[PDB]
Each structure stands twice: as structure tokens, then as C-alpha cells.
Amino acid sequence: PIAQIHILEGRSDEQKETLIREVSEAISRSLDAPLTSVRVIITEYAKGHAGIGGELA
Amino acid sequence: PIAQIHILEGRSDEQKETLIREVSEAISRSLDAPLTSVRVIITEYAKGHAGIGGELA
Amino acid sequence: PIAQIHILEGRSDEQKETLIREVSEAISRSLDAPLTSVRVIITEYAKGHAGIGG
Amino acid sequence: PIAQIHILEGRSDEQKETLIREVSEAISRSLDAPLTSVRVIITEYAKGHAGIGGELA
Amino acid sequence: PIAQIHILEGRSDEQKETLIREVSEAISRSLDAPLTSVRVIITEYAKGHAGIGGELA
Amino acid sequence: PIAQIHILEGRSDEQKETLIREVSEAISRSLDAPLTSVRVIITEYAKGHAGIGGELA
């Protein structure tokens, strides 16, 4: 299983590594899939690259 | 935050509902963002649409 | 420019055709890019495949 | 509704802000969906990262 | 490496198996990366879900 | 056809140009599609943005 996670930039390396672990575990638990088979890639977005309702976040 | 989860098909409806909640939950925790801001979309793949070594799965 | 639009299923052929038209125009106009260079792909999601906050 | 938009780098913030807004409205009108439910994320690509026909764009 | 390939529907299983192999080999060869580390996932699009210039392809 | 290729950062422009071409050739070859219709976009990921099993690379 492969997860692409789109988040706004500004988080620390530690916060994002925690994100990777917990999401991977969340994926593994929900599916009864081996944790080792879980892949996560993070994509960050600058504020001028993210919209909610036609307006920037 | 937006999470795209790519999985092989064949798993049950409830697992995918659990997947959505817990991934949503894990992201909210890791980033301390409101759950309402978290969106999860699942894409399933038939065996002929997935490769790992140039070979199907 | 490439736009991938993720939507919940249930929309009409006309709405999704209109979506392609209007999004393409918006991209071309906003960026001053040639319309012919704009590609849009639509992906539908059954409700059980799309989630908000749980 | 979620729109991921891939564009070549080199545009100004104002153009990309117009892009997010104008695209979001277009999605809202076309689908009869609430504007606030429309999400747009922009990804920029350097010239060496985009190909059209095996050749860089 | 992860490759998402978006194509119009209508191809045979065998063509798409070839797609997975040939692309995976190309990724492995171009990058000098182990073939086993290369993942390919295919997404198909009906003609009404794909546009080239605001018009269906 | 549209190919998004996710790779770890650190490669030179020349290798990634080779990646784009060979992947483009493989796609055209596999599907019997005109090369000019093949689009490839590369997205790079820093080491802290990629996880395999809850852990970084």
C-alpha cells in the first residue's frame, strides 16, 4: 500500500517523521497488512499553493 | 491535509472505512490540525494494474 | 499544465464535460498558457472511498 | 472536490492565486458543489522535470 | 521509485502488463536502481473523464 | 498518457533527463501510442519525506 500525504509546509523534521510512523501504523492496522509493506511519501505545499474555496489557506 | 492511499483491491468495505478514520485521526494528531481539515481518498488497483519488480501483483 | 480532479461519483456526463471545459479555460487564462496545452483528468470516488475527519 | 494542478515553475504568486480562485469557481459551477468544499493544491515543476515526447518541456 | 501512469481505458491486460515491465525496466536502467524497488501503478480513464484543450480527447 | 514518477532526490539533471526519455519510450512502446502524446513529470522526495514501515530510508 502507498500513501501520498499532502500537507502545508512549516512542520519540523520530527513532526513529519512522527507523521510517517503513525500514518503507516494507521494504514497497517486498518488493513491487516504488514507494516513493512507500507510506503509513505510526503509532499509539502507553500501557502500560495493551497486553496480552500478559491482562497489561500 | 490530503491523503491519497493506493491499495490493491480485494479488501472489505469496513476496513476502508476504518482506514479513512484512523489515517484521518493519525494526521490530525501528528500535525495538530482539526479532523475536519483532513481528507482521505482511496484508490484500489486490480492485479494487472500493479507492479513491484516489473511483475504483476 | 495537468489537472487531476478528484470527485465523488454521481455527477452527470454533462457536468463532468463542463468541468473539463471550465477548468481548462481557467487554467489557460490564469497562466496565459495555450488552451491546447491543458490536460484534465477526472477520477471518481465511491463514497466509501472518500473521507473527511473520520 | 480535490484538484491537483501540475504546472511549470516561473509564475508569480498573483497568477497562481488567480489560478486557485478561478479553477475553484469553475469546479463549483460545473458540479453545483459548494465553493468551500473545493480544494486546490499546486505543484510546480522545473524544466528538467517535465517531458513532452521524451524531451524536456 | 514509484510511477503513476494515467492512461485512457481500452487497453488489454497484456498491453498493461508490458507497460509495467517496460517502464519498470526503464526506471531501473535509467537510475541504476534495483528492479525490485520500482513500483508502477496504473489508472485508467474513460473518454468522458479526460480532456485535451477543454474537449474530450 | 501521463506518468508521474516519484524518486528520491539527489540525481543530476542529466540522469533525470535520461529517466524521462526512456520512460516515455517505454510507454509509447507498450501501448502503441504516439510518443508526442506521452507526458512525464518528476517529483523528488527528500529523505525525511519518504517512509518504508514507519521509518525513513
Numbering used by the authors:
A (entry chain F), B (entry chain E), D (entry chain D), E (entry chain B), F (entry chain A): 1 to 57
C (entry chain C): 1 to 54
Extract from the study:
The enzyme 4-oxalocrotonate tautomerase (4-OT) is composed of six identical subunits of only 62 amino acid residues each. It belongs to the tautomerase superfamily, a group of homologous proteins that share a unique catalytic amino-terminal proline (Pro-1) and a characteristic β-α-β structural fold. 4-OT takes part in a catabolic pathway for aromatic hydrocarbons in Pseudomonas putida mt-2, where it catalyses the tautomerization of 2-hydroxymuconate (1) to yield 2-oxohex-3-enedioate (2). Inspired by the versatile success of proline and its derivatives as organocatalysts, we anticipated and found the proline-based enzyme 4-OT to promiscuously catalyse carbon–carbon bond-forming reactions such as aldolizations and Michael-type additions.
To obtain insight into the structural consequences of the M45Y and F50A mutations, we determined crystal structures of mutant M45Y/F50A in an unliganded state and in complex with substrate trans-β-nitrostyrene (5a) at 2.7 and 2.3 Å resolution, respectively. Combined with the replacement of the bulky Phe-50 with an alanine, the M45Y mutation results in a significant opening and enlargement of the hydrophobic pocket near Pro-1. This enlarged pocket in the M45Y/F50A mutant is able to accommodate the phenyl group of 5a, as revealed in the crystal structure of mutant M45Y/F50A complexed with this substrate. The phenyl group of 5a makes van der Waals contacts with residues Pro-1, His-6, Ile-7, Leu-8 and Ile-41 in the hydrophobic pocket, whereas the nitro group is in van der Waals contact with Ser-37 and forms a salt bridge with the guanidinium group of Arg-39. The central ethylene group of 5a is only ∼3 Å away from the amino group of Pro-1. The observed binding mode of 5a in the structure of mutant M45Y/F50A is not possible in the wild-type 4-OT structure, due to steric hindrance by the Phe-50 and Met-45 residues. In conclusion, our results reveal that the two mutations (M45Y and F50A) unexpectedly created a new substrate-binding pocket. This active-site remodelling is most probably responsible for the observed differences in activity and enantioselectivity between mutant and wild-type 4-OT. The electron density for bound 5a does not indicate a preference of this substrate to bind with an orientation relative to Pro-1 that is consistent with the formation of the (R)-product; the other orientation differing by a rotation of ∼180° around the longitudinal axis of the substrate molecule, and consistent with formation of the (S)-product, fits equally well. The progress curves of these reactions demonstrate that this mutant, in addition to inverted enantioselectivity, also has significantly enhanced ‘Michaelase' activity for the addition of 3 to 5a, as well as 4 to 5a when compared with wild-type 4-OT.
